[PDB]
Enzyme design. Sequence first.
Site, PDB file in Angstrom:
ATOM      1  N   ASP A 118      22.223   2.353  13.039  1.00 29.80           N
ATOM      2  CA  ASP A 118      21.063   3.087  13.516  1.00 29.80           C
ATOM      3  C   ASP A 118      19.950   2.233  14.103  1.00 29.80           C
ATOM      4  OD1 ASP A 118      22.024   5.740  12.861  1.00 29.80           O
ATOM      5  OD2 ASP A 118      21.689   5.204  10.750  1.00 29.80           O
ATOM      6  N   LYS A 159      29.759   4.146  12.700  1.00 32.54           N
ATOM      7  CA  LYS A 159      29.166   5.451  12.956  1.00 32.54           C
ATOM      8  C   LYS A 159      27.951   5.219  13.844  1.00 32.54           C
ATOM      9  CE  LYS A 159      26.520   7.633   9.928  1.00 32.54           C
ATOM     10  NZ  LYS A 159      25.325   7.960  10.758  1.00 32.54           N
ATOM     11  N   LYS A 217      25.702  15.398  14.540  1.00 33.86           N
ATOM     12  CA  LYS A 217      25.417  16.593  13.740  1.00 33.86           C
ATOM     13  C   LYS A 217      25.269  17.831  14.616  1.00 33.86           C
ATOM     14  CE  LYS A 217      23.468  14.034   9.915  1.00 33.86           C
ATOM     15  NZ  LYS A 217      23.742  12.723  10.565  1.00 33.86           N
ATOM     16  N   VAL A 218      26.296  18.072  15.417  1.00 37.54           N
ATOM     17  CA  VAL A 218      26.321  19.190  16.342  1.00 37.54           C
ATOM     18  C   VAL A 218      25.937  20.492  15.629  1.00 37.54           C
ATOM     19  CG1 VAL A 218      27.695  20.332  18.095  1.00 37.54           C
ATOM     20  CG2 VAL A 218      28.106  17.914  17.593  1.00 37.54           C
ATOM     21  N   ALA A 219      24.898  21.144  16.132  1.00 39.78           N
ATOM     22  CA  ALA A 219      24.383  22.347  15.500  1.00 39.78           C
ATOM     23  C   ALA A 219      23.862  23.384  16.487  1.00 39.78           C
ATOM     24  CB  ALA A 219      23.260  21.958  14.542  1.00 39.78           C
ATOM     25  N   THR A 263      27.446  25.690  23.821  1.00 39.23           N
ATOM     26  CA  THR A 263      26.797  24.391  23.928  1.00 39.23           C
ATOM     27  C   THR A 263      27.524  23.327  23.115  1.00 39.23           C
ATOM     28  OG1 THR A 263      24.645  25.346  24.464  1.00 39.23           O
ATOM     29  CG2 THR A 263      24.642  23.139  23.476  1.00 39.23           C
ATOM     30  N   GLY A 285      24.312   7.811   2.178  1.00 44.05           N
ATOM     31  CA  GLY A 285      23.322   7.824   1.121  1.00 44.05           C
ATOM     32  C   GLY A 285      23.514   6.685   0.141  1.00 44.05           C
ATOM     33  N   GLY A 297      30.570   2.106  -5.731  1.00 44.18           N
ATOM     34  CA  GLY A 297      31.681   2.398  -6.619  1.00 44.18           C
ATOM     35  C   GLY A 297      31.796   3.854  -7.024  1.00 44.18           C
ATOM     36  N   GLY A 349      24.031   2.129   5.946  1.00 48.74           N
ATOM     37  CA  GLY A 349      23.234   1.725   7.090  1.00 48.74           C
ATOM     38  C   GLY A 349      22.248   0.615   6.775  1.00 48.74           C
TER      39      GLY A 349
HETATM   40  O1  LIG Z   1      23.616  13.794   4.436  1.00 48.09           O
HETATM   41  C1  LIG Z   1      23.555  12.936   5.307  1.00 48.09           C
HETATM   42  C2  LIG Z   1      24.294  12.883   6.564  1.00 48.09           C
HETATM   43  C3  LIG Z   1      24.251  11.773   7.349  1.00 48.09           C
HETATM   44  O2  LIG Z   1      24.994  11.630   8.375  1.00 48.09           O
HETATM   45  N1  LIG Z   1      23.361  10.696   7.044  1.00 48.09           N
HETATM   46  C4  LIG Z   1      23.304   9.538   7.973  1.00 48.09           C
HETATM   47  O3  LIG Z   1      23.872   8.427   7.329  1.00 48.09           O
HETATM   48  C5  LIG Z   1      23.118   7.233   7.589  1.00 48.09           C
HETATM   49  C6  LIG Z   1      22.521   6.760   6.283  1.00 48.09           C
HETATM   50  O4  LIG Z   1      21.980   5.473   6.517  1.00 48.09           O
HETATM   51  P1  LIG Z   1      21.248   4.639   5.375  1.00 48.09           P
HETATM   52  O5  LIG Z   1      22.397   3.819   4.608  1.00 48.09           O
HETATM   53  O6  LIG Z   1      20.409   5.488   4.471  1.00 48.09           O
HETATM   54  O7  LIG Z   1      20.397   3.656   6.095  1.00 48.09           O
HETATM   55  C7  LIG Z   1      22.166   7.620   8.719  1.00 48.09           C
HETATM   56  O8  LIG Z   1      22.744   7.375  10.016  1.00 48.09           O
HETATM   57  C8  LIG Z   1      21.941   9.095   8.482  1.00 48.09           C
HETATM   58  O9  LIG Z   1      21.475   9.792   9.655  1.00 48.09           O
HETATM   59  C9  LIG Z   1      22.572  10.705   5.839  1.00 48.09           C
HETATM   60  O10 LIG Z   1      21.885   9.749   5.524  1.00 48.09           O
HETATM   61  N2  LIG Z   1      22.675  11.853   5.086  1.00 48.09           N
HETATM   62  O1  LIG Z   2      19.794  30.267  18.785  1.00 51.72           O
HETATM   63  C1  LIG Z   2      19.828  29.577  19.781  1.00 51.72           C
HETATM   64  C2  LIG Z   2      19.120  28.331  20.018  1.00 51.72           C
HETATM   65  C3  LIG Z   2      19.164  27.730  21.238  1.00 51.72           C
HETATM   66  O2  LIG Z   2      18.419  26.754  21.539  1.00 51.72           O
HETATM   67  N1  LIG Z   2      20.052  28.195  22.251  1.00 51.72           N
HETATM   68  C4  LIG Z   2      20.164  27.437  23.530  1.00 51.72           C
HETATM   69  O3  LIG Z   2      19.605  28.211  24.551  1.00 51.72           O
HETATM   70  C5  LIG Z   2      20.382  28.141  25.762  1.00 51.72           C
HETATM   71  C6  LIG Z   2      20.919  29.523  26.062  1.00 51.72           C
HETATM   72  O4  LIG Z   2      21.573  29.447  27.322  1.00 51.72           O
HETATM   73  P1  LIG Z   2      22.275  30.717  27.979  1.00 51.72           P
HETATM   74  O5  LIG Z   2      21.108  31.558  28.709  1.00 51.72           O
HETATM   75  O6  LIG Z   2      23.057  31.517  26.970  1.00 51.72           O
HETATM   76  O7  LIG Z   2      23.165  30.164  29.021  1.00 51.72           O
HETATM   77  C7  LIG Z   2      21.386  27.023  25.510  1.00 51.72           C
HETATM   78  O8  LIG Z   2      20.907  25.754  25.976  1.00 51.72           O
HETATM   79  C8  LIG Z   2      21.556  27.038  24.005  1.00 51.72           C
HETATM   80  O9  LIG Z   2      22.040  25.797  23.463  1.00 51.72           O
HETATM   81  C9  LIG Z   2      20.801  29.407  22.069  1.00 51.72           C
HETATM   82  O10 LIG Z   2      21.512  29.856  22.949  1.00 51.72           O
HETATM   83  N2  LIG Z   2      20.631  30.017  20.846  1.00 51.72           N
END
Ligand SMILES: O=C1CC(=O)N([C@@H]2O[C@H](COP(=O)(O)O)[C@@H](O)[C@H]2O)C(=O)N1
Ligand SMILES: O=C1CC(=O)N([C@@H]2O[C@H](COP(=O)(O)O)[C@@H](O)[C@H]2O)C(=O)N1
Lengths: 218, 217
Positions: free
Chosen positions: A13, A35, A65-67, A72, A174, A183, A195
Amino acid sequence: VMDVMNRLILAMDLMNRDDALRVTGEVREYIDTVKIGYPLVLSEGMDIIAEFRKRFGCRIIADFKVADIPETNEKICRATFKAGADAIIVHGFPGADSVRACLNVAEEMGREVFLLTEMSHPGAEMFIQGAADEIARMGVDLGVKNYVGPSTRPERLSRLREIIGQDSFLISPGVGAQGGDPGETLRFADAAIVGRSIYLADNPAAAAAGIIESIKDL
Amino acid sequence: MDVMNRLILAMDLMNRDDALRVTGEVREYIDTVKIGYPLVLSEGMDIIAEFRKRFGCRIIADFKVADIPETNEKICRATFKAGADAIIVHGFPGADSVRACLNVAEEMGREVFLLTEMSHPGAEMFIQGAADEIARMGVDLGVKNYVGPSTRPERLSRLREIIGQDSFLISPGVGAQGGDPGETLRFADAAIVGRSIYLADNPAAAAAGIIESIKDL
Ligand SMILES: O=C1CC(=O)N([C@@H]2O[C@H](COP(=O)(O)O)[C@@H](O)[C@H]2O)C(=O)N1
Ligand SMILES: O=C1CC(=O)N([C@@H]2O[C@H](COP(=O)(O)O)[C@@H](O)[C@H]2O)C(=O)N1
């Protein structure tokens, strides 16, 4: 499942190309799986994945963390795999259709999806924890084989392992900076994500070696 | 935030040439563009500065930030350094993760938009049940900008009720996902439209048409 050297995944990171490359190179002999997340990608561009592939013999997990909505998510996965990422991490809280969208692209493109169930930070207790067991079950039903669970909550990590079964692959962040023990984490996770404990140390190589020495029997 | 014609363009094309051409084709109808990962991960973060240089539009970085506090801080910093005026953050990961974003936003003179409930069917599984609580959390944290679903007007209305008329609310799901621009604007300050515009045979005529349907608003 992917063969993670020393059951240790580096969470790179750092947000500077030179520093990211220096540190990763310094621990090259201990870790072959890296990662890469948005702190680095949004700072140096998606070409950083290519650079890491060229410079190191390392597997790349894109922690994005695709959300988003299905449409999209599909585009995000396509762009990420096009860049050379071996796997991508996806949030399960937005629902099954959003996860399936990622699974479909991964299947089509020959890559892998990791499902993030519960998170490791304090705020995860507010909304994510209560849905975590169901998110994991959803992942199993969708055919997900790779998961991410919190090292900061052993009891929760253990329950996640139970839900997904021994065959599923589980990585856990974590460890170190957030309080997780290497461990204990590996009692349930296949690999530990570390990280700051490594990339902020005076000697990243020694830090990595120390962590590995602590789990030698594992 | 003053959004021209209460219409925000969701520029999710993944080609620099097309993205720039389409945006320019509708520039007379908007002054606010939402740039997300589809474009950024395909063309790079430099795209944000390019849009500001060519259109002067305000940019909302739709990155649905959903990491731990420490990583969220880094993401926002990198995003604002790129020239984004605002960033969209998920509320589901909890208060500390939202606070991290609010801190960087204040430091760099930017805005945080809190996504409370999503517009797709999958939002019903976990997000919807926590949405009201997420919105209240936003109020407790001092959040003033929110994102709610055009696809569920009753839910968008509830979100507006929770945050009050003083708060700013933008809403996606208009057009392609089934949301109606006019009904959406009964509750949201601005409607987000993507495909209905950028995939239209004539983007400009598409934008003009949407604005035509809400001219009385
Ligand atoms: O629950 C989660 C998910 C995750 O991906 N991460 C990621 O894991 C890494 C943790 O790094 P660190 O060892 O705390 O420095 C970072 O890249 C975070 O964004 C996290 O810390 N918690
Ligand atoms: O609940 C949500 C959140 C959001 O940001 N979006 C975003 O809003 C846009 C909607 O585009 P569209 O008009 O369906 O083509 C996209 O960029 C999505 O990622 C969504 O569609 N729903």
